[PDB]
């Protein structure tokens, strides 16, 4: 009789932007009365539904996809912005209607060293379109001769890891992106 | 040898400020966190919240929110626990535990302060 | 607030027996769920962690299998010097939450 905001946003590990994990949050009360008014976030940005009024629309599907960027690519989860995570990684649609809460997380996920496992897709022979994950991991072949299972010249593997170090400056720090897509 | 040892049984009077020491060696005290758990002696463990081991950020478990505090001394490899205005209902061993940023499965080894009050 | 349950609450056993412990969440915990024991007076052990994979230099009599929110260890072969109070716990939400325990008791 209440919807699951503990399992997508009290939770140890959020996923990595190419896999980025979606859950069906349906039947139950939503309160985004917690979420809008706690200041842990750093991006609430709501396109489409005002962030303020947002408790009593009867929101049909609400599904709260979840992953982990770079400090400075909040940027490109917000509807039209276009580039390594809009393209490569994941796409808010042109016509978003929900929110993109985020948080810079430095603590949870920043290792002395470099936590390698929060990662990204970089070479991408495939604009994604709306929402796609494409988990692949194909070696992009990019100036002629197919390389086809070898990683060498002028032949890159997509998957690259962030590595996040908590020296890092809070724009290269590991960010926890949970949009918010309503109907 | 990987081992964190640990201060001895304390024992003071409800409303004291006292403060277990959990010192660790053998690996790279940074590279994992510190959570620190209690045990009451007729019921089972209760995670209490880490510290990032580079910064000192005490993120406490949603019901210890108040009077524990989690002083680290980083360059000496300790990862101090303070619990301040103590009861007489925290009767409870109060162990460290390695548990990282990435796994947060213990490896619970503390060997267990015995903080009795009355 | 993840209710973790193990069942039953004090299960008695015999030597050389196979027993089997289980553990109920009360939401979702997928894979993370680790297994400890605790003899008495003594800082718990590690025995199990992710539910599936074996912790590295524990005597291999148990291993452990579930997901979901039903998880368990079976002791493939019992000795009496256990008697441990067996913790699950898992790693999915803050606050990570154990169990109570299933003592172990011989007859
Ligand atoms: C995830 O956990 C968060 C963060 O803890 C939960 O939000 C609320 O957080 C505050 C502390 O940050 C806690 O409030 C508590 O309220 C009770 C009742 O007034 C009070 O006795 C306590 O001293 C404390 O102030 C509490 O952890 C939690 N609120 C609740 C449930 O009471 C949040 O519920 C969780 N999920 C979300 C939406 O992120």
Redesign the pocket.
Known sequence: NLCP??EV??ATRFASVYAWNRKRISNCVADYS??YN?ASFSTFKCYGVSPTKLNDLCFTNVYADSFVIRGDEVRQIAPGQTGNIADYNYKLPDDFTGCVIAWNSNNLDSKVGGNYNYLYRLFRKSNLKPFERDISTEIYQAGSTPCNGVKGFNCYFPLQSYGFQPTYGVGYQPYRVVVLSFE | QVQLVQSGSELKKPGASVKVSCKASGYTFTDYGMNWVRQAPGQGLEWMGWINTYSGEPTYA?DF??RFVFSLDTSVSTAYLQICSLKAEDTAVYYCARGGNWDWYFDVWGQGTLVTVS | ?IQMTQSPSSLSASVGDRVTITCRASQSVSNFLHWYQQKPGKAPKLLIYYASQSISGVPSRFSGSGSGTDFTLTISSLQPEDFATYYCQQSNT?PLTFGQGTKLEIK
Do not use: E, M, Y
């Open positions: 905001f503990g946003f009290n917690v979420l706690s | 949603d929110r108040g | 607030d803050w």
